[PDB]
Design a protein around this ligand. Sequence first.
Ligand SMILES: [Cl-]
Ligand SMILES: [Cl-]
Ligand SMILES: [Cl-]
Ligand code: NA
Length: 129
Amino acid sequence: KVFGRCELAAAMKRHGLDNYRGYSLGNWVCAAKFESNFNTQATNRNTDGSTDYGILQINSRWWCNDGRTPGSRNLCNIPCSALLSSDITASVNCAKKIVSDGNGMNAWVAWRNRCKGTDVQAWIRGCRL
Ligand SMILES: [Cl-]
Ligand SMILES: [Cl-]
Ligand SMILES: [Cl-]
Ligand code: NA
């Protein structure tokens, strides 16, 4: 599923990401835009053989099991395929664990390089929330 901007904002808000660990909703929408272009089915292979999955591009090296990343962990205790569902519950719940692990949203390279320090509120502007 390819989400609309305000559509995703609403879903993220309902699932409790607004101001989660101090990150306003605009940050999460901005991250999703540049990580996946709002596409739940997005995948990208990394150099070390790991793969990033879903609307927030969560990495199989640490966070989920795809059965082809030897020596990796599964800290969200889920199959990576679950991160590709039209239902973003699994991605959000796993994202909550990631952002809590000490490094905040710097875990998402696209957020650091394209969202951090910008007017992120613009990403939920006009949305009925
Ligand atoms: Cl915001
Ligand atoms: Cl594996
Ligand atoms: Cl933080
Ligand atoms: Na893994």
